[PDB]
Curated annotation (Swiss-Prot), chain A:
Function: Attaches the virion to the cell membrane by interacting with host receptor, initiating the infection. The major receptor is host ACE2. When S2/S2' has been cleaved, binding to the receptor triggers direct fusion at the cell membrane. When S2/S2' has not been cleaved, binding to the receptor results in internalization of the virus by endocytosis using host TFRC and GRM2 and leading to fusion of the virion membrane with the host endosomal membrane. Alternatively, may use NRP1/NRP2 and integrin as entry receptors.
Assembly: Binds to host ACE2. RBD also interacts with the N-linked glycan on 'Asn-90' of ACE2. Cleavage of S generates a polybasic C-terminal sequence on S1 that binds to host Neuropilin-1 (NRP1) and Neuropilin-2 (NRP2) receptors. Interacts with host integrin alpha-5/beta-1 (ITGA5:ITGB1) and with ACE2 in complex with integrin alpha-5/beta-1 (ITGA5:ITGB1). May interact via cytoplasmic c-terminus with M protein. May interact (via N-terminus) with host bilirubin and biliverdin, thereby preventing antibody binding to the SARS-CoV-2 spike NTD via an allosteric mechanism.
Record protein name field: Spike protein S1
Superkingdom to which the source organism belongs: Viruses
Positions of the UniProt region annotated as Integrin-binding motif: 45-47
C-alpha cells in the first residue's frame, strides 16, 4: 500500500509463462487505482499452475 | 519442474484509494463539462465547487 | 386516490432507478467501471448481462 506501480513493466517481461487475469484486463492496470494490493507468493509444480 | 507463482488480488472497496498505476494528474476545471477520473471512479460531468 | 396515483408512479420510478444499481450477475452495476477495467472481448460479456 501507499505507493505507485508501473504494471506495464511486468506486462512487457517475456519471463512470465502466463499473465492471466480474471477481473481486470492487464493493459488497463496502469490507469486504475486500488485500496489494497494483496500480493501472495509461492513455489509449485508446473502441472499444478 | 518447479514454478515461481504470484497472485495479485486487488481490493476495489468503496474506500480511500492507496495504490495507483502511473497516470499524470492535471489542473482542476470548474463549470465546464469534462471527462473526469478521480481515483478510478471515472465519469463525465460539470465539476462545480 | 390522487396521493395513491402519485405514490405508485413515484414508487415505479424509485424501483426503476434502484434497478440500475443491481449487478444482474455482472462484476459491477457501475457501467463505466466495467469499461475502464476491461477490454471489449471480456467487457462485452459483462455488458451483455
Amino acid at each position: 500500500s501507499n505507493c505507485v506501480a508501473d504494471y506495464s513493466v511486468l506486462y512487457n517481461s517475456a519471463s512470465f509463462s502466463t499473465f492471466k487475469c480474471y477481473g481486470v484486463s492487464p493493459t488497463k492496470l496502469n490507469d486504475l487505482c486500488f485500496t489494497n494490493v494483496y500480493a501472495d507468493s509461492f513455489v509449485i509444480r508446473g502441472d499444478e499452475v | 519442474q518447479p514454478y515461481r507463482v504470484v497472485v495479485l488480488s486487488f481490493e476495489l472497496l468503496h474506500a480511500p484509494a492507496t495504490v495507483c498505476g502511473p497516470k499524470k494528474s492535471t489542473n482542476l476545471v470548474k463549470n465546464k463539462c469534462v471527462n473526469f477520473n478521480f481515483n478510478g471512479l471515472t465519469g463525465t460531468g460539470v465539476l462545480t465547487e | 386516490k390522487l396521493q395513491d396515483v402519485v405514490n405508485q408512479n413515484a414508487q415505479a420510478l424509485n424501483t426503476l432507478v434502484k434497478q440500475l444499481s443491481s449487478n444482474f450477475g455482472a462484476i459491477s452495476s457501475v457501467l463505466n467501471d466495467i469499461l475502464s477495467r476491461l477490454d471489449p472481448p471480456e467487457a462485452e460479456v459483462q455488458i451483455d448481462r
